[PDB]
Write an enzyme that holds these catalytic residues in place. Structure first.
Site, PDB file in Angstrom:
ATOM      1  N   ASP A  35       9.645   8.249  -6.543  1.00 37.72           N
ATOM      2  CA  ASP A  35       8.699   8.453  -5.459  1.00 37.72           C
ATOM      3  C   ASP A  35       9.296   8.340  -4.064  1.00 37.72           C
ATOM      4  O   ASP A  35       9.470   7.227  -3.560  1.00 37.72           O
ATOM      5  CB  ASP A  35       7.553   7.442  -5.641  1.00 37.72           C
ATOM      6  CG  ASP A  35       6.399   7.589  -4.677  1.00 37.72           C
ATOM      7  OD1 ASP A  35       6.382   8.566  -3.931  1.00 37.72           O
ATOM      8  OD2 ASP A  35       5.549   6.685  -4.626  1.00 37.72           O
ATOM      9  N   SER A 199       7.329  20.732   9.850  1.00 39.58           N
ATOM     10  CA  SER A 199       7.416  22.118   9.410  1.00 39.58           C
ATOM     11  C   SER A 199       7.172  23.026  10.619  1.00 39.58           C
ATOM     12  O   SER A 199       6.371  22.691  11.496  1.00 39.58           O
ATOM     13  CB  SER A 199       6.371  22.402   8.333  1.00 39.58           C
ATOM     14  OG  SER A 199       6.393  23.759   7.913  1.00 39.58           O
TER      15      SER A 199
HETATM   16  N1  LIG Z   1       1.871   8.269  -5.221  1.00 39.41           N
HETATM   17  C1  LIG Z   1       2.351   7.334  -6.218  1.00 39.41           C
HETATM   18  C2  LIG Z   1       1.567   7.420  -7.523  1.00 39.41           C
HETATM   19  C3  LIG Z   1       2.229   7.701  -8.710  1.00 39.41           C
HETATM   20  C4  LIG Z   1       1.533   7.763  -9.914  1.00 39.41           C
HETATM   21  C5  LIG Z   1       0.160   7.549  -9.932  1.00 39.41           C
HETATM   22  C6  LIG Z   1      -0.626   7.605 -11.250  1.00 39.41           C
HETATM   23  F1  LIG Z   1      -1.341   8.770 -11.325  1.00 39.41           F
HETATM   24  F2  LIG Z   1       0.249   7.506 -12.300  1.00 39.41           F
HETATM   25  F3  LIG Z   1      -1.528   6.580 -11.311  1.00 39.41           F
HETATM   26  C7  LIG Z   1      -0.494   7.234  -8.749  1.00 39.41           C
HETATM   27  C8  LIG Z   1       0.206   7.175  -7.548  1.00 39.41           C
END
Ligand SMILES: NCc1ccc(C(F)(F)F)cc1
Length: 330
Positions: A35, A199
């Site tokens: 992430d 952008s």
């Molecule tokens: N943005 C980060 C994120 C990653 C995964 C999820 C989920 F869907 F797995 F809960 C939520 C938020």
């Protein structure tokens, strides 16, 4: 040193991507969600509340001869989608496709929210935004990329997400065979702790390019492309039957539609997102209304260049002393 690992979509819609990560000694392999929008490396574990684990692979710190409890350290994070997780912290050896960091902070979850429990394919997240966002208290911890940076051949990582197919995360090098043309680099503001860039504009299908500044973040942890209402309205106005639905929570369109492409500007360069990339399937099982991949950022506070946009490009997250973002067609 360098590291190279394959990233795989968790489902047929590319709702998220998972990359195998080795933690501890002997190695315990967990599939994490890399992430670039957050900075915590957190995992499902032997400490997670039993009713909150449903299919995920867990990290067991007691089985790792290199795991050490970080005394008094705790973490708690809330994501933009409403999901959350929290727990305690260990330092341990973490490796991603050959690249190893000793003493990496591995945040062990004691609690996870329903959405994480419901996603059996995601064993946790590996934060790649700036370490200023890390939630470890009372002593903030560094990201995996931050810890590996000085050792890398080049202080960079790349994201090459596939459309309905596997992709790659490389650390410490640029694979010149993974893209066409050249990489266009653009300025990054680290003030909000994100890979935040501007952008230069957009186009809808074969339409005229609109020169306009769109400030947003390069976020692999967000599935969709979130842009200003004016932009998103211009896009969906080209799809017959498309509408913004308050009951669904966004723009929906007839599943029988063939979507136009969406082009975004990176300096004088253009990244073209093919129309099929904006189709996120039926709103509910068996429905003939489909969910759009481009949505309004009006209720967010920031524009998000998520997987819909990033998977159309070879993306360089340049961690040089002045960080920058590079984009190339592929
Ligand atoms: N943005 C980060 C994120 C990653 C995964 C999820 C989920 F869907 F797995 F809960 C939520 C938020």
């Amino acid at each position: 040193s360098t590291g190279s690992a394959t990233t795989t979509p968790i489902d047929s819609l590319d709702d998220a991507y998972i990359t195998p990560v080795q933690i501890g000694t002997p190695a315990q392999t967990l599939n994490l969600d890399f992430d670039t929008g957050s900075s915590d490396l957190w995992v499902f574990s032997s400490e997670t509340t039993a009713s909150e684990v449903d299919g995920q692979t867990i990290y067991t710190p007691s089985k790792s001869t290199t795991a050490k409890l970080l005394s008094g350290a705790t973490w708690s994070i809330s994501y933009g989608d409403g999901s959350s997780s929290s727990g305690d912290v260990y330092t341990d050896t973490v490796s991603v496709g050959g690249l190893t960091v000793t003493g990496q902070a591995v945040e062990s979850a004691k609690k996870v929210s329903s959405s994480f429990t419901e996603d059996s394919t995601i064993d946790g997240l590996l934060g790649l935004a700036f370490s200023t966002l890390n939630t470890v208290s009372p002593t903030q911890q560094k990201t995996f990329f931050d810890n590996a940076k000085a050792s890398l051949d080049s202080p960079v990582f790349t994201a090459d997400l596939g459309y309905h197919a596997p992709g790659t995360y490389n650390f410490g090098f640029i694979d010149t065979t993974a893209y066409t043309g050249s990489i266009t680099y653009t300025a990054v503001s680290t003030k909000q702790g994100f890979w935040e860039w501007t952008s230069t504009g957009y186009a809808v299908g074969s339409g005229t390019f609109k020169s306009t500044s769109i400030d947003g973040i390069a976020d692999t942890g967000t599935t969709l492309l979130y842009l200003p209402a004016t932009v998103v309205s211009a896009y969906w106005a080209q799809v017959s039957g498309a509408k913004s639905s308050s009951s669904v929570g966004g723009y929906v369109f007839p599943c029988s539609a063939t979507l136009p492409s969406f082009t975004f500007g990176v300096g004088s360069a253009r990244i073209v997102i093919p129309g099929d990339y904006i189709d996120f399937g039926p709103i509910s099982t068996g429905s003939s209304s489909c969910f759009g991949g481009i949505q309004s950022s009006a209720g967010i506070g920031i524009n998000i260049f998520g997987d819909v946009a990033l998977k159309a490009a070879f993306v360089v997250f340049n961690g040089a002393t002045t960080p920058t973002l590079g984009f190339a067609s592929k």
